[PDB]
Design a protein around this nucleic acid. Structure first.
Lengths: 87, 332, 332, 87
DNA sequence: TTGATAACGCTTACAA
DNA sequence: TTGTAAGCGTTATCAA
């Protein structure tokens, strides 16, 4: 699976919102990742997602592979716009 | 005597072990049993005692948190970050203010270690060689949050304060400024004397601009010390054209103070605050500031502690989160 | 592996029993023995395990605090009081965020009661009968803080909000105002609907003034809601001449939203905030607010809890601290 | 022994300072009291002191009556001026 | 004054 | 699956 968004959120991918995104990806078996122009981290890791410093006006790529690698990518996409993060 | 795991067992006609397995969700209970016991638990109004759980298990699923003062717009936000990542990992927190009093800090440390915390997150402004020594001989993992430690030998998470100020002063220098001031925080705390300040002095040296003592004002994090810093600077024969505040709270003091003297921000004075707190936005004009992922600091710090409490490997004990300047309207 | 009282008893040819007596300064202990084991402990660096003690003594000298959002300028202020008086009485604290989520609130309550807290201080925007049920089921005292409970069953400490909004609204009439608008907090919460909104309507019908169901804006305690509120009240054919917000933070949104629209405070409009937080001192023009002893509320509540935990007799479990108003530059 | 002050504090007897005044009156065996507007409360009691509602302007009256009612009244004055709560 | 020795409420091998 | 029993560190009850 895979999907590239564009952080629209002012605060970017940080704080509670970033936390929620990391928890969602956490409940799925399939491995989930987040690639920010170059580096790639584990979306199920609070340290990884917050270390990129993904600010508004950036492009990321959320990928998922494994068992529920489908429902995973879907749920994330939802959270993404649900928490008012990326498009 | 009052509804203990023993009573629940008698009621469901099983052993204490099965009541303990059902209570902990251990997958080894014949459904007809796990049910029989959950029934009993209900009818008896049973609530598992965590203290007894603690004594037995050798851990209490709660961590310690020494904060200088939680009523601070800053530390409080940093606290919500810690608390949220702890809940994430089924952990409770014991909060306590230190007021930066070394006596109290070291004491709280000893109390919490006494209450058998599985870990601690520490926030202070002056970590001495002793604090370090104390931390090092702690039974449980200790992690600093947004604090400065010259001896940098205690895991911690924060940002590079010397570089953040530098970036901010440079930015203003590139805008053609030449007389840039700096309203700092108590020079006692290293973060102000050894980091923020040097970041300031460096940008100027790498710009070939001379250091002007009169351009360094020492506030105390107080919105009012902000108003006073301005007055003093706009009192000099050679006034600044731009001012960098080591804190947003002080920055609003700067804006309003100058706003009262008739100056017109940003036209008459470029102002830049530090922290990017909720205040930055609630100001007219909108305050340009150096962004510090405060919450993230509190969260990555607690997330680091979970790894350490779970005796798992970790790459680098010192962590630096990124920073960036967000320009609003308090700047031409 | 910390050292138990057995290691001490060893290092002093005494029995665990006397070590225990020496650690709790039991009278009947020959001075020779006391100082012998006393220095013995120090030689071993013995720190008593509070969990083990907690099992036996059925007392953990720790109260649990349930608060909606500690990053809040208001709640964190309350947290300081609770915390200060707590330390005064040698009580530790477990702080947890609820975010005004019933599920979380009742869950936190179970959790704290599970770790054997000796008491609880509860703060929430919506106390339902389902809460009172769980409250009444608490083995340890429970004191409310700055919250509203229609049932009036749980001991709480706060101020008459209805009276407060009234005093404010009237004060505006005494100055002439006829069309006074009200910007409240989520109506879902009783404190806004049943207490503040009432004290507002009362002051009106009691002042023969007609209630205008359009002068009531429902902000969400946010700075933006208060910002979007003034933009609304300044649209209707009939627009207000004075506005009273339920919280200072909304107040600034009102001040600014207006300043951005050209109108200047207080010249065109008169604004009064509620709570009297540092936010009301860091605004231009300085905001007039309905004063509220936020820290006192937290501190009186924790002091009351201590009186209930010590099982000592107490008069009127429902306390009310006095309130006043502090006018500044936001009102002519 | 007793002395009268005039609350110069901007916030009056409240917040931390208030708490400080009360913790000082408790460091002494003597019976410290505090009268205001015709009502006397224990100065060691957080509930009493903070229930009065002493605001800027008003004037209080700190009492005392014990083997150290002196060292106490003095100490009370120290704090009364340290945080700036009348004089 | 001291010192054995039960509680305290629950986790966990080790067994059955 | 389910039961048995040995801890875990302190306080507390009785006798010495």
């Amino acid at each position: 699976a895979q999907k590239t968004f564009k952080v629209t959120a002012d605060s970017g991918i940080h704080a509670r919102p970033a936390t929620v995104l990391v928890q969602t990806a956490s409940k799925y078996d399939a491995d989930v990742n987040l690639e920010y122009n170059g580096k790639t981290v584990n979306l199920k890791s609070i340290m990884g997602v917050m270390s990129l410093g993904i600010a508004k006006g950036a492009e990321i790529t959320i990928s998922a592979s494994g068992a529920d690698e489908n429902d995973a990518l879907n749920a994330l996409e939802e959270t993404m716009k649900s928490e008012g993060l990326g498009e | 005597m009052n509804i203990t795991i023993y009573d629940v067992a008698r009621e469901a006609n099983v052993s204490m072990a099965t009541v303990s397995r059902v209570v902990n969700g251990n997958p080894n209970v014949k459904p007809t049993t796990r049910k029989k016991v959950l029934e009993a638990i209900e009818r008896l109004g049973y609530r598992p005692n965590a203290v007894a759980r603690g004594l037995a298990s050798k851990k209490t699923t709660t961590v310690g948190v020494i904060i200088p003062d939680i009523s601070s717009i800053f530390y409080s936000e940093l606290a919500r970050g810690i608390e949220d990542i702890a809940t994430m990992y089924k952990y409770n927190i014991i909060l306590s203010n230190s007021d930066q009093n070394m006596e109290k800090e070291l004491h709280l440390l000893n109390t919490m270690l006494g209450k058998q915390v599985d870990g601690i997150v520490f926030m202070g402004g002056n970590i001495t060689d002793e604090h370090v020594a104390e931390f090092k001989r702690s039974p449980v993992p200790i992690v600093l949050a947004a604090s400065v430690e010259e001896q940098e030998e205690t895991p911690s998470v924060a940002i590079d304060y010397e570089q953040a100020i530098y970036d901010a002063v440079k930015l203003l220098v590139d805008k053609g400024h030449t007389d840039i001031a700096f309203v700092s925080g108590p020079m006692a705390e290293p973060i102000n004397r050894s980091k923020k300040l040097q970041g300031y002095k460096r940008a100027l040296e790498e710009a070939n601009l001379p250091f002007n003592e009169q351009f360094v004002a020492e506030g105390d994090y107080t919105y009012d010390s902000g108003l006073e810093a301005l007055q003093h600077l706009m009192s000099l024969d050679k006034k600044p054209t731009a001012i960098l505040s080591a804190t947003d709270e002080m920055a609003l003091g700067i804006i309003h103070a100058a706003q009262d003297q008739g100056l017109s921000i940003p036209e008459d004075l470029d102002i830049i605050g530090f922290d990017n707190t909720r205040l930055s936005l609630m100001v007219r004009p909108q305050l340009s500031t150096v962004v510090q992922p405060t919450y993230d600091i509190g969260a990555v710090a607690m997330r680091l502690l979970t790894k350490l409490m779970n005796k798992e490997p970790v790459e680098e004990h010192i962590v630096e989160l990124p920073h960036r300047i967000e320009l609003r309207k308090s700047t031409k």
